[PDB]
């Protein structure tokens, strides 16, 4: 034999796969560099043929079990083919799930937000909403884009995601998994390897523990950014509260990088930009690639395959034909390595060259492994490798030695704090976001979070873990998580968290080999053959051995440790604590940007109606908002002589309780930024209080508008 016939199948598969796969990879590379309808069909056909082959082999794998298999190599490859996935679900179920996926992706990709002033002007996310959330500093404009994004695509994705979760859970359970979240946590789980065995739930425990270790550093980062956000947005951020979600520098606040502009530690101190020296030395995309190649050779990692140089898009085509410019370390397989990108003579492109070629290094290293064992130890291994490469190249020492940076250059501690803070905005900033998103999804898939509490717990977790508060209350009709790409396009996120830890562990380990005597933040692992050896140990390993063992191959550990990440930001941390000496460090999970104008309203029924008391449902709540809108309209048309078309939707109700207590704040008919002041609202309430009581058969005693005192 069974184990022998299993090996026989895998061997046959590997040989055939390599060629069939080559076609698919090559075909795509050709189109990616050609972008021709002819090539579209070519890659499409190749993909179908390749995918079909894999499917057929999956069935063959099933025949041979894994228990009687003793050899790990064969066992691993067999498991990697035997995986049934959505095939376990019925044709109808699979087709529906596929439709859900397509619809969700289409909504996200083609969803438009029309400007309230002019409906004819409608912005998509990527081109318009992104240039606002990344560039626009107008509180109102930022709020508009943020709220509208969740008020349109997010709402459409709400029902889709719900069904998606159900079908995904079915598939995972049918594939012998606790939930779809457990299905995802299978990636790190390791079995039958003594002293390397890993568990899906163990991943959760590890991530949570490590998150607690970074908690304090993030707290200081939040406190510092909070102060700066307060200056950028006066009367919009409380010094003890959370951070409005629409002011985090992007649509979802995933990175704080854009906040760097307003949070720069030392404005006078700029950042090293060799993009000019490169041009002065007549640097080229090819030049920077050769420099990346030399960087690897300096640490012993081999030179780029001559063939790679022959077949690699290392610049913009800028001809009759066009090509995808996205940096990509292509591995066509059967000893074929390539890189597609429209790179230029820019410091970023220089660092990107090191990053992309670093991936190629990993690909080449595990290229000797079995077809199914040619991949990063885990999902967060390959990207981490790329990251450390770019980091070492970014080091001023590297630029100075390569001539990009002046030998006479002096790196001021202030400039270093500037560098470190900018990195913290991209790294420490995404750690809570990534943790909280995966925690929420995991809970949702395992049923910890009921559908009626999805949005409820989403914003509770956001206020607590991330210290971020919603600028406007979002009920379960909203699907803010789905409004993010990875959620809407069914992707895991814990990869990013684990990658960040791995990257710093790898860098620090390589620094130890490099015998670096400076801060890890400015550690340059270039010219470190020994460090290259450690990296290579896991590089060549591929997926043949467990990721925990691969960690030992470089970092010399089994589980991920955030200590190296903390060590890297230790200088910044000290500075942050110094800056946050006077300021409050923390946040209030109770602070809301709309709490000030929020009127709490207790509805008493058994006290007044008693017997035959109507039950307060969503329709009762519908009537209430409509009643408030009515009062606002009357008040404006009479007191201010302004016929304003107030609507129940302008009535932003929040904190609904079984006591029938809630807080509501009226806003402008079509301007979320324009929230009607509590004073004016109280005047409207008093004017129609009788009528409101009539609508619910209640009275001032039963219908308590806290603050609105009956006379």
């Amino acid at each position: 034999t069974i184990e022998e016939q299993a090996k026989t199948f895998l061997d046959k598969f590997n040989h055939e796969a390599e060629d069939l796969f080559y076609q698919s990879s090559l075909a795509s590379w050709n189109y990616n560099t050609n972008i021709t309808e002819e090539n579209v069909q070519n890659m499409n056909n190749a993909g179908d043929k390749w995918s079909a082959f894999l499917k057929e082999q999956s069935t063959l794998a099933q025949m041979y079990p894994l228990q009687e298999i003793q050899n790990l190599t064969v066992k691993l490859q067999l498991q990697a083919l035997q995986q049934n996935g959505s095939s376990v679900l019925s044709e109808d179920k699979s087709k529906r799930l596929n439709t859900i996926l397509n619809t969700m992706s289409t909504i996200y990709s083609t969803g438009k937000v029309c400007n309230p002033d002019n409906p004819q002007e409608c912005l998509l996310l990527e081109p318009g909403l992104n240039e606002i959330m990344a560039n626009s500093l107008d509180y109102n404009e930022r709020l508009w884009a943020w709220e509208s994004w969740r008020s349109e695509v997010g709402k459409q994705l709400r029902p889709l995601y719900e069904e998606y979760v159900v079908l995904k859970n079915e598939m995972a359970r049918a594939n012998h998994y606790e939930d779809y979240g457990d299905y995802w946590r299978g990636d790190y789980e390791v079995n039958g390897v003594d002293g390397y065995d890993y568990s899906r739930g163990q991943l959760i425990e590890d991530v949570e523990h490590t998150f607690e270790e970074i908690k304090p550093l993030y707290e200081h980062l939040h406190a510092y950014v909070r102060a700066k956000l307060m200056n950028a947005y006066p009367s919009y951020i409380s010094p003890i509260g959370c951070l409005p979600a629409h002011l985090l520098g992007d649509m979802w606040g995933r990175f704080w990088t854009n906040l760097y502009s307003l949070t720069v530690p030392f404005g006078q101190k700029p950042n090293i930009d060799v993009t000019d020296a490169m041009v002065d030395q007549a640097w080229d995309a090819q030049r920077i690639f050769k420099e990346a190649e030399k960087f690897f050779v300096s640490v012993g990692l081999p030179n780029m395959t001559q063939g790679f140089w022959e077949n690699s898009m290392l610049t913009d085509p800028g001809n009759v034909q066009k090509a995808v410019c996205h940096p990509t370390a292509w591995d066509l397989g059967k000893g074929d390595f390539r890189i597609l990108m429209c790179t230029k003579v820019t410091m970023d492109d220089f660092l990107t060259a090191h990053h992309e070629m670093g991936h190629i290094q990993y690909d080449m290293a595990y290229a000797a492994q079995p077809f199914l064992l040619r991949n990063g130890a885990n999902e967060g291994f390959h990207e981490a490798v790329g990251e450390i490469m770019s980091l070492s190249a970014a080091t001023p020492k590297h630029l100075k030695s390569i001539g990009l940076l002046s030998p006479d250059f002096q790196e001021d501690n202030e400039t270093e704090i500037n560098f470190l803070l900018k990195q913290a905005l991209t790294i420490v900033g995404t750690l809570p976001f990534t943790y909280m998103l995966e925690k929420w999804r995991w809970m949702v898939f395992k049923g910890e979070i009921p559908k009626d509490q999805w949005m409820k717990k989403w914003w509770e977790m956001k206020r607590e873990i991330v210290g971020v508060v919603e600028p406007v209350p979002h009920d379960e009709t909203y699907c803010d998580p789905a409004s993010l790409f990875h959620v809407s396009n069914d992707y895991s996120f814990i990869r990013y968290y684990t990658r960040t830890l791995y990257q710093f562990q790898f860098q620090e380990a390589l620094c130890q080999a490099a015998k670096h005597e400076g801060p890890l933040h400015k550690c340059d692992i270039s010219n470190s053959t020994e460090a290259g050896q450690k990296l290579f140990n896991m590089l060549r390993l591929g997926k043949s051995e467990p990721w925990t063992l691969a960690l030992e191959n470089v970092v010399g550990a089994k589980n991920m440790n955030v200590r190296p990440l903390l060590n890297y930001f230790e200088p910044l941390f000290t500075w942050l604590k110094d800056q946050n000496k006077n300021s409050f460090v923390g946040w209030s999970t109770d602070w809301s940007p709309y709490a000030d104008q929020s009127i709490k309203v207790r509805i008493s029924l058994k006290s007044a109606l008693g017997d035959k008391a109507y039950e307060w449902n969503d329709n009762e709540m519908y009537l209430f908002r409509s009643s408030v809108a009515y009062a606002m309209r009357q008040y404006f048309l009479k007191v201010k002589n302004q016929m304003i078309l107030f609507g129940e939707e302008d009535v932003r109700v929040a904190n609904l309780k079984p006591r029938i207590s809630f807080n509501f704040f009226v806003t402008a008919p079509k301007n979320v930024s324009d929230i009607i002041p509590r004073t004016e609202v109280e005047k409207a309430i008093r004017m129609s209080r009788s009528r409101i009581n009539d609508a619910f058969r209640l009275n001032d005693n039963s219908l308590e508008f806290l603050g609105i005192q009956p006379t």
Binding site: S604, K606, P658, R659, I660, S661
Partner: protein
């Protein structure tokens, strides 16, 4: 019921003291601030009135909480 937004009529004479401590455990910081009077029926009886108060303060009040108050 107010300080803890309990559903109106969830807490009664049958379940006051157990929901005092329960809610205390649930949120003590948000329970301590609550103020409770010593509502004991027995004391209300030992609460004697001085002077002419039995006719002009005890009977006259009790009459107002009895239908046909004016006749009474």
């Amino acid at each position: 019921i107010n300080g803890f937004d309990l559903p109106e009529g969830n807490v009664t004479q049958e379940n006051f003291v157990d929901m005092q401590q329960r809610c205390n455990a649930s949120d003590p910081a948000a329970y301590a601030q609550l103020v409770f009077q010593t509502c004991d029926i027995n004391a209300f009886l030992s609460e004697a009135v001085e002077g002419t108060g039995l006719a002009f303060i005890v009977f006259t009040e009790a009459i107002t909480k009895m239908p046909l108050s004016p006749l009474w």
